[PDB]
């Protein structure tokens, strides 16, 4: 219908503006923090988040041209593999950097003595290599299971195929069900429940301590915290909820296709999540006064 076509075109323009603003913002943040700023734990986390967002955004036009004509991949198997691995790695990277930034801010606010004594650059690197390792562990299913297949009608889509792993159609279908359920629950728990619980608790304790100590000279800190939490929620929760609904309804969708709304709802939610990945440095880095001074000096 007319509304459905608009609902399909909207993710395309959302991803285009996501690509543009992500490229510009991540480039500026990298140029200022990495080269024109002194190394700092907060600066290090911001640089890692911006690098993840830029690496995701660099391959985002591939996702744009894939969603333009319905998941079709004009490129080869290796290039689709690389693009998907990069997108997956950078998405878990952005989520885990958001969670770790929340944890670091909570540690600095609640325990300033420990942050002053122990939060160092070398320790920052030693604890920041961890989220990337977790991203690789959560992405390895893309490393092995994801392949490229061609429909006999002529169209090609590089998605999960289990001909070699299953060895038989029944075993392949069983392995598909098992891996899809495991990936869905893992994404919901570690990718969404783990950081959202961390982000809400970490920023919740920060606001509780600031309000208790009477450090609220202006509404700007509370406004920034509320904006961060609200944006992260209203962007990631829709996509994660859609993915969880598709996972719990795996058999119904695969065998009978009872729930078709998820099929047309993944794209807007994915576009919203990618827009959140785009806007993360806008309210995580640009809010800092020193960063603005360095940018206007550059």
């Amino acid at each position: 219908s007319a509304g459905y076509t608009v609902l399909r075109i909207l993710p395309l323009v959302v991803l285009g503006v996501t690509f543009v603003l992500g490229v510009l913002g991540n480039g500026l943040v990298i140029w200022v923090a990495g080269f024109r700023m002194t190394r700092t734990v907060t600066t290090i986390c911001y640089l890692n988040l911006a690098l993840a967002d830029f690496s995701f955004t660099a391959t985002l036009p591939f996702l744009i041209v894939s969603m333009a004509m319905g998941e079709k991949w004009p490129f080869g198997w290796f290039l689709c593999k690389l693009i998907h691995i990069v997108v997956d790695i950078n998405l878990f990277g952005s989520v885990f950097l958001i969670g770790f930034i929340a944890l670091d801010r909570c540690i600095c606010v609640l325990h300033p003595v420990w942050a002053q004594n122990h939060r160092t650059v070398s320790l920052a690197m030693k604890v920041i290599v961890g989220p990337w390792i977790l991203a690789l562990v959560l992405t390895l299913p893309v490393f092995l299971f994801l392949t490229t297949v061609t429909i006999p009608n002529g169209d090609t889509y590089c998605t999960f195929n289990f001909a070699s792993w299953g060895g038989t159609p029944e075993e392949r279908l069983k392995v598909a069900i098992t891996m899809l359920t495991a990936r869905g629950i893992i994404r919901f728990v570690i990718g969404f429940l783990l950081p959202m619980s961390i982000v809400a608790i970490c920023y919740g304790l920060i606001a509780a301590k600031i309000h208790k100590k009477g450090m609220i000279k202006s509404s700007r800190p509370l406004r920034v915290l509320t904006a961060v939490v609200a944006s992260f929620f209203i962007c990631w929760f829709p996509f994660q909820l859609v993915a969880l609904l598709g996972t719990v309804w795996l058999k119904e969708m695969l065998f009978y296709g009872k729930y078709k709304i998820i099929d047309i709802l993944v794209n807007p939610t994915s576009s919203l999540a990618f827009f959140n990945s785009c806007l993360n440095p806008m309210l995580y880095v640009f809010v800092g006064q020193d960063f603005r001074e360095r940018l206007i000096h550059s």
């Binding site: 998941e71 959560l138 998605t159 598909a176």
Partner: peptide
């Protein structure tokens, strides 16, 4: 986190 890709070993329904 992870892009939503849905398929089986061979048909599935997904959205990029």
């Amino acid at each position: 986190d992870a892009e939503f890709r849905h398929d089986s070993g061979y048909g599935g329904v997904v959205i990029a």
